[PDB]
Design a protein around this ligand. Structure first.
Ligand code: ANP
Ligand code: QMK
Ligand code: MG
Ligand code: MG
Lengths: 523, 332
């Protein structure tokens, strides 16, 4: 059987596991009594592997062998501008392998191993699995893992691969605002209501407009940024004090991983205090060359360093209203989820966007996504106290084909309810052409050069025939997980010839994943 | 997963009770996406469709549930009730066609408006019948070849030989077989295919295939049985059972049956569409047009007919008949 299915929020900075059992939903605390665990992995010089609180608590004294924010590298390529820019800001070594960013660390004894970003996330999911196993007293084999609503195809498939390596059958990847909406409607049966979910966390940002109705969750429009969150807010404060320290002492601590990571930890602590205080102090003894650090960060200064980023979070709210053809007066409640929504300026911009409407209070914004994942996990396990929970979720990105001239020809438009299928006829351009190549793109821009490349597919096995004669129907199906599957079939009359498809996505093959699964089972 | 389908069905029924039919529609659709073989969802979705008086869709959902569960009581009962309603819907649409075809033939043939439209419609029929198979010749280029007897540079000889072959086939039918009082023979079918494929393939033009070819997942008769199948086909032609059929239904069945037999290597579609209009023209109906844009729909109803149900094909031919009658009445 499926056992006890758990819900895991796999966040950029913080992960959280919960279960729906015995007629209620519970967040499960780790071995240190913490309801939420940092998405951290570290390797001590003695050879001990650390995950979670222990991995983060030694970041300052071991920044090169401490891995974090791997969610900003999963499902990406080495040539990704976001990847190349994040290399300069991460204290651990990232090398190119199979055109993908791989993490290289020292595991003690002078031996250095290289991990795929899916393997790093697999360790975090393993810590969440073991946290639930220690609480339930039995092995956990199935789970529902959260992903940002704006994750693309590669990011969604990579997250499922991380669960596979962690020894988990990912029954469902659930979008964060959809999961947050489930947590909002668990105690409410009030008919049809329009909800706007504002999900701003450590590394990602999502805004979804949902129509709730007594257990039915209908996502109308979603839009956001997978690379916008609290980590970018801390960096603005980090870069401010690095220039200030250079101005006062003439020292450039930019190349010192130990000093920079000490500043990042204290900057993140001061940001949390500034949500309830107006001034926070940052003290770091032996910060650089035995010189201590002592500065005060004002809330007004913190808002000043991030005001452009704070204001940019209103554009997705504007886009989901335009796509849904709804006005501000149509929104019944506003739900703020994610750790970064605790910022008073964020709550002020959202409130002033909706003309002073107070957001809905009640659900912990740090755990709301984790609650909904657990409730959906209870539904998929057939729990006698879940109800008829139905999720009508959509795809965030428009799938298109690159035609002649670099034009983005829309196949499946954005905000299309999943699962969905779309078929289209393709033919050959030259006589006796044995292969037809199709390039799929994700994005809303008119030209494919501005959109993200999902993959290049080739339709081999075409028998000799004049141009225009072959009739290949290619079907594009997006599953309930939001992941695309491409299939081709001959539609002309005569002998039905098999059309084999090959791609250049260069993702983790099943043989490579099985090696990573066995390498993880050795712990 | 299938466990999620039952929940979507429960909410679909719950939203139907409250009058939220648009949301119930989506939930019915989501249920069948989670489990395409959900017998309960298929049956309840058919009840939902029948409430909107979409009995044709309801009968499809009922039949789809009975292919999985042949003894499902609620599907058997509701399909029996829906069967007379489907016949009434098809008869009602035929009566609308008879109301329009008697109106277009009531005006005298000497009218300049009708004769001008009928003249340019001829080249339209040649255009649509070859372009639905992949011919890239434009209407003006087709008219240029037939009227001036000058080739069009930059266009392939095969595409031009198809147009000229179709022109010789329509002129033969319009002046020898339409007004002929006698019955339809095998030599008539062989003579139309000889005209259709005469310039493209002079070898195979005017003779049946001697080898067993395939038509997709559809298996046509064996070569030694083609002539027997063709003789029984033309025996179904000129029959009292076929005359009692509606002219649209009779011309549509003769279209599919000839495609079903697939007696030639090539030109089966073009030959069947010519036979379809010859039947319609003999019954007083104007020749209908299966437009180039309807290529995919034409394939879908053909594939549906090859898989048990030829009624969607007949309704497709009927909708094509009403479309050309509306454009003819637009001249007045
Ligand atoms: N009181 C607070 N004030 C300001 N920021 C906070 C506060 N509490 C937490 N945060 C930030 O919120 C983020 C963590 O929230 P969370 O919603 O878990 O994001 P996440 O785990 O990275 N999920 P995601 O970003 O969508 O991948 C971190 O950047 C924290 O620094
Ligand atoms: C699902 C399905 O049944 N597809 C096949 C539909 C079909 C098409 N035809 C006619 O056959 C000729 C071409 O045949 P090829 O073997 O050369 C064409 O006119 C087409 O309309 N019959 N069934
Ligand atoms: Mg989290
Ligand atoms: Mg988020």
């Amino acid at each position: 059987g499926s056992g006890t299915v758990v819900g895991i929020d796999l966040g950029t900075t913080y992960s959280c596991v919960g279960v729906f059992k015995n007629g209620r939903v519970e967040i499960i605390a780790n071995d240190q009594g913490n309801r939420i665990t940092p998405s951290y992995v570290a390797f001590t010089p003695e050879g001990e592997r650390l995950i979670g609180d222990a991995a983060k608590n030694q970041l300052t004294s071991n920044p090169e062998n401490t891995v974090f924010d791997a969610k900003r590298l999963i499902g990406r390529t080495w040539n990704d501008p976001s990847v190349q820019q994040d290399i300069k800001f991460l204290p651990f070594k990232v090398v190119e392998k199979k055109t993908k960013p791989y993490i290289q660390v020292d595991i003690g004894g002078g031996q250095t191993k290289t991990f795929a970003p899916e393997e790093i996330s697999a360790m975090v999911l393993t810590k969440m699995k073991e946290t639930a196993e220690a609480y339930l007293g039995k092995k956990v084999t199935h789970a529902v893992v959260t992903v940002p609503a704006y994750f693309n195809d590669a990011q969604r498939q990579a997250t499922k691969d991380a669960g596979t390596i962690a020894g988990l059958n990912v029954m469902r990847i659930i979008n964060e605002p959809t999961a947050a909406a489930i947590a909002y409607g668990l105690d409410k049966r009030e008919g049809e209501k329009n909800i706007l979910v504002f999900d701003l966390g450590g590394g990602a940002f999502d805004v979804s407009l949902l129509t709730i109705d007594n257990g039915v969750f209908e996502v109308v429009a979603t839009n956001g940024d997978t690379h916008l969150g609290g980590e970018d807010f801390d960096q603005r404060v980090m870069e401010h004090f690095i220039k200030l320290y250079k101005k006062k002492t003439g020292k450039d601590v930019r190349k010192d991983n130990r000093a920079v990571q000490k500043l990042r930890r204290e900057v993140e602590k001061a940001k949390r205090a500034l949500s309830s205080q107006h001034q926070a102090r940052i003290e770091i003894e032996s910060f650089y060359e035995g010189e201590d650090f002592s500065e005060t960060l004002t809330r007004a200064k913190f808002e000043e360093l991030n005001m452009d980023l704070f204001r940019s979070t209103m554009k997705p709210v504007q886009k989901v209203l335009e796509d849904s053809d709804l006005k501000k007066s149509d929104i019944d409640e506003i739900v703020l989820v994610g750790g970064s929504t605790r910022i008073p300026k964020i709550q002020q911009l959202v409130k002033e966007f909706f003309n002073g409407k107070e957001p809905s209070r009640g659900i912990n914004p740090d755990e709301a996504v984790a609650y909904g994942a657990a409730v959906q996990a209870g539904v998929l396990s057939g729990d006698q106290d879940t109800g008829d929970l139905v999720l009508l979720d959509v795809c965030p990105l428009t799938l298109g084909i690159e035609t002649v001239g670099g034009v983005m020809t829309k196949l499946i438009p954005r905000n299309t309810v999943v699962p969905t299928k779309k078929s289209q006829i393709f033919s050959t351009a030259s006589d006796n052409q044995p292969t037809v190549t199709i390039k799929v793109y994700e994005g809303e821009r008119p030209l494919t050069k501005d959109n993200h490349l999902l993959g290049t597919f080739d339709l081999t096995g075409i028998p000799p025939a004049p141009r225009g004669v072959p009739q290949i129907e290619v079907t594009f199906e997006i599953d309930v997980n939001g992941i695309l599957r491409v299939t081709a079939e001959d539609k002309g009359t005569g002998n039905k010839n098999k059309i084999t498809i090959t791609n250049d996505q260069n993702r983790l093959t099943p043989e490579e994943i099985e090696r990573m699964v066995n390498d993880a089972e050795k712990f | 997963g299938k466990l999620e389908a039952r929940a979507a069905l429960n909410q679909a029924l719950e939203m139907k009770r409250q009058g939220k039919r648009e949301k119930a529609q989506k939930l019915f659709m989501h249920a069948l996406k989670m489990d395409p073989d959900f017998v309960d969802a298929l049956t309840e979705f058919g009840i939902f469709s029948e409430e909107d008086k979409d009995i044709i869709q309801a009968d499809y959902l009922y039949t789809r549930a009975l292919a999985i569960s042949p003894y499902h009581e609620k599907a058997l009962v509701n399909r029996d009730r829906a069967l007379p309603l489907v016949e009434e819907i098809d008869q009602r649409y035929f009566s609308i066609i008879d109301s329009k075809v008697k109106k277009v033939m009531s005006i005298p043939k000497g009218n300049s408006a009708l004769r001008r439209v009928m003249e340019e419609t001829y080249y339209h029929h040649i255009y649509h019948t070859v372009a639905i198979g992949g011919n890239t010749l434009t209407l003006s280029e087709i008219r240029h070849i037939l009227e001036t007897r000058y080739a069009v540079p930059g266009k392939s000889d095969e595409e031009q030989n198809e147009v000229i072959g179709m022109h010789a086939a329509m002129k033969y039918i319009n002046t020898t077989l339409v007004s002929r009082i006698g019955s339809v023979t095998i030599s008539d079918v062989l003579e139309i295919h000889r005209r259709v494929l005469g310039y493209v393939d002079p070898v195979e033009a005017g003779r049946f295939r001697t080898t067993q070819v395939l038509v997709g997942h559809h298996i046509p008769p064996h070569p030694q049985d083609v002539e027997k199948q063709m003789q029984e086909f033309v025996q179904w032609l000129n029959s009292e059972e076929a005359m009692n059929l509606h002219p649209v239904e009779f011309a549509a069945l003769a279209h599919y049956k000839l495609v079903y037999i697939h007696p030639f290597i090539d030109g089966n579609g073009r030959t069947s569409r010519l036979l379809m209009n010859l039947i319609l023209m003999q019954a007083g109906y104007p020749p209908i047009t299966i437009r180039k844009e309807q290529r995919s729909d034409y394939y879908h109803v053909l594939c549906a007919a090859n898989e048990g149900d030829v009624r969607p094909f007949i309704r497709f031919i009927a909708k094509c008949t009403e479309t050309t009658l509306d454009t003819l009445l637009f001249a007045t």
